[PDB]
Design a protein around this ligand. Structure first.
Ligand code: NAP
Ligand code: NAP
Ligand code: 14M
Ligand code: 14M
Lengths: 255, 253
């Protein structure tokens, strides 16, 4: 049911687009002829991405460098991006703070930083974007992980942040349903992807290029969840039908 | 296989014990003859709770009033509590910041406060308690909710904080398994309970007295999860076998 034309002329923010899945998403949106605003801390890598976007046939491509540790930057970023495109059709929240695979001892500053960059900054970006997304009847895409659905050692702070995104966005999705806010929320559950970050930090990784295209497709098709894993078995097990029943058994009782 | 005597003479911290489930847990541990240290913001209420604990037959009962927004208080409390009892056998993390069941608009300070009180403070308390819990081969009890497993409207910040507890504690449980740290982690998934807080905020809720005894029982029996709900049907639906399989799929390795 997805057609690349669905993205032609669309106004899209992609966070964490200097590298990995983010950079790949920005390139796919460009090949489809969308207006893209990209961000990361690194100005020079961002520049290279923006020019390559214009080479692929993007309607427009821009960058705004900054840290998502700074909540005022998150706020002002959406404002300038919106100004550049004259509005916003899709918000792709994808960035993450640097983490290493390590046992948890006492790094409370690291738990805080992850919670700030990976979680609160997503909430702050959403609040800022919500008036524009309401106008266009837009979409919010939240890039999560299997580590944000299930428990693995070595990723406690990261898992906590990804789990937090599920609780927050999944609850606001129920609120938008009742409030009749026509803004879709897509949560992406990915397994290990072949990004240079992941490859160095860590089985069989899945291709970054297809992963990127799937995230966009899911968002465009207004899906609640998107699954992307190198295994058939893992994808079958990602789904939580009891959760759905539990959730739906409340709504079909009060609403 | 639970016996009340398993708690006799045991050293236990109970957070959020001025009211609700927390206060009830503190009373149950008191009837079993345990050493209890209780905490909350409310000093005059904690006093009344402590004296009632000693009336029920607690080996000792003490309190330390303070706010879990303050991370240094969280740190200081565990040392102070650990000094009072000469060690720690069980850590019951139960407190929550005040929330109302409203639609989310733009209250970022509220998302932050919930994340700090309901989540960060639990992590800070754990880090502080871990050396003592290692000595006794202790237990950490994390009080969560169904709203921390499943999605409901009107509780976004609260859900985020409860979901975060699951990811963090469930991952550290895997780390303690590989590191061979003999400290158990119990996550409690509760439905509505008949506490004044809940009866004011939001409805056939489950009794707080039995809820309180179950949390303790689960912790004592070193269970990974504890379920407590007024519905048998809901209870059946809480288990996630696919998650378990995905988790163990990795383990080997
Ligand atoms: N790769 C996998 O195996 C995998 C698996 C499951 C889920 N995911 C999820 O997929 C998403 C993309 O990950 P990825 O593999 O593409 O990782 P990545 O290559 O490390 O990309 C992270 C991006 O965030 C940026 N960033 C870092 N710190 C930042 C900060 N403080 N403020 C703003 N931006 C910051 C990075 O660039 P700068 O350094 O230029 O700031 C980069 O553009 C993440 O949400 C991740 O959790 C990935
Ligand atoms: N009752 C339910 O329907 C329900 C449902 C699911 C899960 N649960 C879980 O069960 C636990 C107990 O809930 P409850 O209904 O018994 O709630 P409660 O009566 O409101 O008790 C929460 C406790 O936390 C303390 N507290 C509040 N803000 C604090 C702060 N900033 N710093 C330190 N302590 C603070 C309160 O004391 P002060 O104001 O004196 O500080 C109180 O003793 C929670 O983890 C809750 O999520 C309950
Ligand atoms: C012990 C590794 C935990 S991290 C992690 N584990 C995942 N598992 C466990 C290993 C096998 C794997 C198999 C699969 O693809 O089905 C599924 C899947 C995704 C992540 C993840 O999002 N990793 C981050 C870490 C920080 C940097 C970004 C990437
Ligand atoms: C829409 C209400 C969401 S709050 C909430 N809902 C729960 N549900 C939804 C209603 C029906 C209920 C039925 C059940 O027992 O199976 C299951 C269960 C627990 C909570 C909860 O943790 N409550 C907190 C809120 C803040 C104050 C402290 C208590």
């Amino acid at each position: 049911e997805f057609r690349p034309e669905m993205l032609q002329g669309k106004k899209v923010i992609v966070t964490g687009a200097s590298k990995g899945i983010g950079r790949e998403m920005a390139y796919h949106l460009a090949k489809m002829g969308a207006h893209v605003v990209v961000t990361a801390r690194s100005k020079e890598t961002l520049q290279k991405v923006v020019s390559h976007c214009l080479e692929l046939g993007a309607a427009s491509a821009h960058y705004i460098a900054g840290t998502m540790e700074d909540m005022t930057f998150a706020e002002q970023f959406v404002a300038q991006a919106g100004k550049l495109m004259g509005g916003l059709d899709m918000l792709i929240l994808n960035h993450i703070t640097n983490t290493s695979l390590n046992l948890f001892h006492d790094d409370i500053h690291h738990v805080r930083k992850s919670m700030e960059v990976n979680f609160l900054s997503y909430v702050v970006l959403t609040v800022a974007a919500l008036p524009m997304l309401k106008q266009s009847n837009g979409s919010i895409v939240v890039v999560s992980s299997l580590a944000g659905k299930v428990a693995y050692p070595l990723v406690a702070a990261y898992s906590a942040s990804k789990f937090a995104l599920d609780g927050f966005f999944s609850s606001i999705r129920k609120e938008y349903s009742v409030s009749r806010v026509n803004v879709s929320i897509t949560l992406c559950v990915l397994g290990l992807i072949d990004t240079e970050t992941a490859m160095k930090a860590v089985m069989q990784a899945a291709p970054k290029e297809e992963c990127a295209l799937e995230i966009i497709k899911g968002g465009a098709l207004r899906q609640e969840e998107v699954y992307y894993d190198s295994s058939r078995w893992t994808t079958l097990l990602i789904r939580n039908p009891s959760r759905k029943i539990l959730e739906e058994l409340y709504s079909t009782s009060y609403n």
